[PDB]
Each structure stands twice: as structure tokens, then as C-alpha cells.
CSV table of C-alpha atoms in Angstrom, one decimal:
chain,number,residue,atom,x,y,z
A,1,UNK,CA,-21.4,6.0,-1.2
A,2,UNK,CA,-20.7,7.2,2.2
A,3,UNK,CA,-18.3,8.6,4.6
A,4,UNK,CA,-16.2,11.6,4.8
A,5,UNK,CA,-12.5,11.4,5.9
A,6,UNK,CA,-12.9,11.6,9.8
A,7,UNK,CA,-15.7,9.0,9.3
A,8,UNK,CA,-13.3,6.6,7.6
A,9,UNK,CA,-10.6,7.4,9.0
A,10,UNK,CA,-10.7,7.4,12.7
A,11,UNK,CA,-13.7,5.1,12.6
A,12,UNK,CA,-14.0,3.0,9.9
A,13,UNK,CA,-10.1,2.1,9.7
A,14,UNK,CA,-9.1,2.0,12.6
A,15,UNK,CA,-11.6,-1.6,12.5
A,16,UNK,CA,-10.7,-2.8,9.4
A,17,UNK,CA,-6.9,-3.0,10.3
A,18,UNK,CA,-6.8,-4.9,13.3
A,19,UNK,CA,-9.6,-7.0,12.0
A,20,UNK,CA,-7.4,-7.9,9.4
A,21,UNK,CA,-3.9,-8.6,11.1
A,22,UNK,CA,-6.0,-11.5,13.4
A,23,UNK,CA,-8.1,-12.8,11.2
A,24,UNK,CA,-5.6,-14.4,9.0
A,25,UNK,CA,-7.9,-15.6,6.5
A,26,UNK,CA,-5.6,-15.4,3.4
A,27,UNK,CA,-8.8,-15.5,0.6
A,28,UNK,CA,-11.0,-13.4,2.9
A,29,UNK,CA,-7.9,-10.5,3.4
A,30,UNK,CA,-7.2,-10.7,-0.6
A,31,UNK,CA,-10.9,-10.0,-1.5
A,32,UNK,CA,-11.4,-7.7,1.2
A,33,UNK,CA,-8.5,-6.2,1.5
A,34,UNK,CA,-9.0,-5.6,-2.6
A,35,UNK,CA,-12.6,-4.4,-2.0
A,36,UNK,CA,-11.1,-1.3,0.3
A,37,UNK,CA,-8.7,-1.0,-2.5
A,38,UNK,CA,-11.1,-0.8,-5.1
A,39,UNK,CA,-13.5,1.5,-3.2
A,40,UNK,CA,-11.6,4.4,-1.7
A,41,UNK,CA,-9.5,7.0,-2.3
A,42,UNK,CA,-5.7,7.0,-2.8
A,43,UNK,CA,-5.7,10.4,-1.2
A,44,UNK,CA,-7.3,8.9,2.1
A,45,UNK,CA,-5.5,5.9,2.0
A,46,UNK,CA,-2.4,8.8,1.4
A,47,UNK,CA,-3.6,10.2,4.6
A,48,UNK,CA,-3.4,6.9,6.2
A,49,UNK,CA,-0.2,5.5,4.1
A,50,UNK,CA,1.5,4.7,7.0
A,51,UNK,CA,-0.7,2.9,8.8
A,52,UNK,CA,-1.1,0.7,5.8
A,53,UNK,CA,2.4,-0.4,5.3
A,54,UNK,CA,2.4,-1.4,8.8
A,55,UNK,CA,-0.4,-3.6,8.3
A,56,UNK,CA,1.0,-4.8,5.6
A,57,UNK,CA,4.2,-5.9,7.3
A,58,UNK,CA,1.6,-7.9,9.5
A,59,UNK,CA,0.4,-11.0,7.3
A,60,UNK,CA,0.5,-14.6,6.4
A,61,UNK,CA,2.1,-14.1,3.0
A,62,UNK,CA,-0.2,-16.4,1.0
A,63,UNK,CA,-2.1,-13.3,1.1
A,64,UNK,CA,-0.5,-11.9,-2.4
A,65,UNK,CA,0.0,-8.0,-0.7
A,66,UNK,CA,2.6,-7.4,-4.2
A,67,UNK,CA,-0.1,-7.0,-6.3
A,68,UNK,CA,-2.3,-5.5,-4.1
A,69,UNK,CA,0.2,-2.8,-3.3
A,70,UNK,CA,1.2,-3.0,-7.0
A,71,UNK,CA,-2.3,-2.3,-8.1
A,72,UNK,CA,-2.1,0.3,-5.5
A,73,UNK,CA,1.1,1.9,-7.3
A,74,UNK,CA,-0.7,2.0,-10.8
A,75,UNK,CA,-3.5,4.0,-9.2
A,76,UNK,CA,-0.8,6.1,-7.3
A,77,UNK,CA,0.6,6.3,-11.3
A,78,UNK,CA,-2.1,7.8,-13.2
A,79,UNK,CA,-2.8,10.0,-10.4
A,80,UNK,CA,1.2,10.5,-9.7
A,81,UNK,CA,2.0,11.9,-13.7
A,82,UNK,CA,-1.7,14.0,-13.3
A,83,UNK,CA,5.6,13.7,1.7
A,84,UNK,CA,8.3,11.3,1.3
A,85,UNK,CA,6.5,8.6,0.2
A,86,UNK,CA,9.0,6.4,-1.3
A,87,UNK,CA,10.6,7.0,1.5
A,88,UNK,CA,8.1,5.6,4.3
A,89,UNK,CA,7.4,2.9,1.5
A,90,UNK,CA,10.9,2.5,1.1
A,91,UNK,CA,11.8,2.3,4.7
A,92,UNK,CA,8.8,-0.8,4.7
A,93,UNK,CA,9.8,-2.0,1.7
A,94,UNK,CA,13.0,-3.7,3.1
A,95,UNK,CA,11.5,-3.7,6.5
A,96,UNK,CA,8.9,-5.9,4.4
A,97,UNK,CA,10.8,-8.0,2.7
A,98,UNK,CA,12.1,-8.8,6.2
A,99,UNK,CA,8.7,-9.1,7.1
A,100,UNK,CA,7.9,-11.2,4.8
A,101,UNK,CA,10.3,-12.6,3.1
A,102,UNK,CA,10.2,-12.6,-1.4
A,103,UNK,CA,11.7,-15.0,-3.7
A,104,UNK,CA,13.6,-12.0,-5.4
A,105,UNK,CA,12.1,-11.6,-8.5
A,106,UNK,CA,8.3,-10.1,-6.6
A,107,UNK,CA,10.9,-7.7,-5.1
A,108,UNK,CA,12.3,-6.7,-8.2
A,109,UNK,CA,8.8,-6.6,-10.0
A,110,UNK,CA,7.8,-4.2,-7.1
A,111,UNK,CA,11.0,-2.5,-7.6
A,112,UNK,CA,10.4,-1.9,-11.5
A,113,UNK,CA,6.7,-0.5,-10.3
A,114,UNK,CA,8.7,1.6,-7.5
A,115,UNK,CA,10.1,3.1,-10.5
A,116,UNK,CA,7.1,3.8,-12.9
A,117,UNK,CA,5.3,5.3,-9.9
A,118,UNK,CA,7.9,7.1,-8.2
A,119,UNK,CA,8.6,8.7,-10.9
A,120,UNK,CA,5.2,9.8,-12.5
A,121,UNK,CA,4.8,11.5,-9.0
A,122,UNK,CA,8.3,12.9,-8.7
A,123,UNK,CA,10.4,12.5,-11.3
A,124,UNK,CA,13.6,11.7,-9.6
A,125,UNK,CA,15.4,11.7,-6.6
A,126,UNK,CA,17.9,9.7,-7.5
A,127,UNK,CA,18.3,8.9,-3.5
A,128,UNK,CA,15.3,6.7,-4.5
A,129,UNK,CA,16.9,5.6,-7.7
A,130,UNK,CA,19.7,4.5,-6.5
């Protein structure tokens, strides 16, 4: 019920980030994390995509980030059927799974998502399908 896009984004994300990364706390990161999620824009969070994939390659992986950034894709999808994203994404994703690390189904799960969202925004690039 506030802020405009400088107001978030220089100012208001810049704090939520590293507070984040340090503060560990796997059930206070999920629902907080979630309540950014559920409160602001896709756009901004667009604007700021890549600053968000690099925090997520920063956590203690109790924190369940696949559904987060799952739920994140669905809202991406009914925007997406309505920038290189995949790409950047893409580029995290493996750095990710290195970051993390998956038992290989979450991956694939992520992966079947990849799909329904990359292609409601662009429907192909078989680069990404392949």
C-alpha cells in the first residue's frame, strides 16, 4: 500500500536481501521471503530478477526456495501467456543446483515448471528446450 519502484528498489531491497542471506532463519526466510512474494510485483521483482537469483544461490536449503521460485513461475505464467530470462534463470539454475544441491526429482519438478512458464512467456526457443 506503498512504494514506488525507486522506493523499493534501491531502498527497500537492497535491506531485505542481505538481511536475508545472514539471518539464516529457515521458518522466518520461508514466511518472509513468501510475504515479499505475495506482496509485490513480478514486474519489480523482473527489474530486480537478478539480484534475486543471486540471493537465492545464498541459503541454508531447509529454506524450500523450489516452491517459492515455483510459485514465482506460476505468477510469471498467467502473466507470461497474457530479456533473456530463462537464460539468467537458466545460467542460476545449474549454478543453483550447485549451490545448493537437489535430490533430482525438485530439479526436474522446476524443470517441468521451466517449461509451462517459459513457454507462456515465449513460446519456444528451443535453446531453452533443449
Amino acid at each position: 500500500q506503498l512504494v514506488d519502484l525507486p522506493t523499493y528498489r534501491d531502498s527497500i531491497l537492497g535491506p531485505l536481501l542481505e538481511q536475508i542471506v545472514q539471518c539464516r532463519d529457515i521458518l522466518a526466510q520461508e514466511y518472509l521471503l513468501e510475504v515479499i512474494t505475495q506482496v509485490f510485483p513480478d514486474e519489480y521483482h523482473l527489474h530486480t530478477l537478478d539480484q534475486f537469483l543471486g540471493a537465492v544461490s545464498r541459503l541454508n536449503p531447509h529454506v524450500n526456495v523450489k516452491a517459492i521460485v515455483i510459485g514465482m513461475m506460476n505468477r510469471l505464467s498467467d502473466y507470461a501467456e497474457r530479456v533473456p530470462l530463462y537464460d539468467i534463470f537458466f545460467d542460476q539454475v545449474q549454478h543453483l543446483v550447485q549451490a545448493q544441491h537437489l535430490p533430482i526429482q525438485d530439479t526436474i519438478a522446476l524443470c517441468c515448471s521451466l517449461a509451462n512458464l517459459s513457454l507462456n512467456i515465449y513460446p519456444e526457443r528451443l535453446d531453452y528446450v533443449d
